[PDB]
Amino acid sequence: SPGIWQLDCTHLEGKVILVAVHVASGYIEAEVIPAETGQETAYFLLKLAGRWPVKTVHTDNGSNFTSAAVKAACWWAGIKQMNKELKKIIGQVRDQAEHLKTAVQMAVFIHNKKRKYSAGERIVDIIATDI
Amino acid sequence: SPGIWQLDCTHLEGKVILVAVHVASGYIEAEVIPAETGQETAYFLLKLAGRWPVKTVHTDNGSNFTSAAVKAACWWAGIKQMNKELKKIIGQVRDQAEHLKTAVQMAVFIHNKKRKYSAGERIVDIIATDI
Ligand SMILES: [Mg+2]
Numbered sequence A, B: 001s002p003g004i005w006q007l008d009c010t011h012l013e014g015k016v017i018l019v020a021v022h023v024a025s026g027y028i029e030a031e032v033i034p035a036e037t038g039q040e041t042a043y044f045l046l047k048l049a050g051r052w053p054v055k056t057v058h059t060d061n062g063s064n065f066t067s068a069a070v071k072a073a074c075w076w077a078g079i080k081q082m083n084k085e086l087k088k089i090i091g092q093v094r095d096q097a098e099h100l101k102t103a104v105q106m107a108v109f110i111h112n113k114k115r116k117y118s119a120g121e122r123i124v125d126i127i128a129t130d131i
């Protein structure tokens, strides 16, 4: 289904990377956050939902979605209830950037633009078709 | 052309909001930033470019794109060289959220989901067609 996304946090260099995967396409978006918190997850969800038609979200850690901030964002946006390779692509590009956050976005870019149709093409195609 | 975007900063409550508009569709993305700086603009561009096929970017303030950080991000991503109404939608929703940044994302969401075909549908349709 085109409205399904998966959301998890990974850890790297004492930092937290939030990663959302559009399940059908393989397209990702990520952010480096300071803390793994409800407030950061809510904010991220709100951004994601203004951009794509987000219907449902899954996670591998259920307690991620327990905070009032998260429930409030899901309620308002109408939302209902790669991490290893991204880390490889990040390893590759790490030297090219000072800050981890920039390396993360370079890795997202590479992952989404790689044909092997790319994930960024697949997401747009799946969403347009569903309109 | 589907690869054209416009990028500007506006000011609100002592804070900076970066706003990118996909010119053909009217779709926007925004972030609240602390400082109007080259480093924040570069980072934003890198995020935007991993997500959509960004070919060219325009701004109303040319000096925005002068920093080495910006030029380096445009170089790497292969990029070449609403603000009033968004502020209205933000005024409307301001009370519903504590922090300006959340109000901003609510306003982006509203702007992109409004049919009056929405901007979020138009962007996906224009990009898919161009593939
Ligand atoms: Mg997790």
Ligand SMILES: [Mg+2]
Pocket: B007, B008, B009, B010, B059, B060, B061, B064
């Ligand atoms: Mg400006």
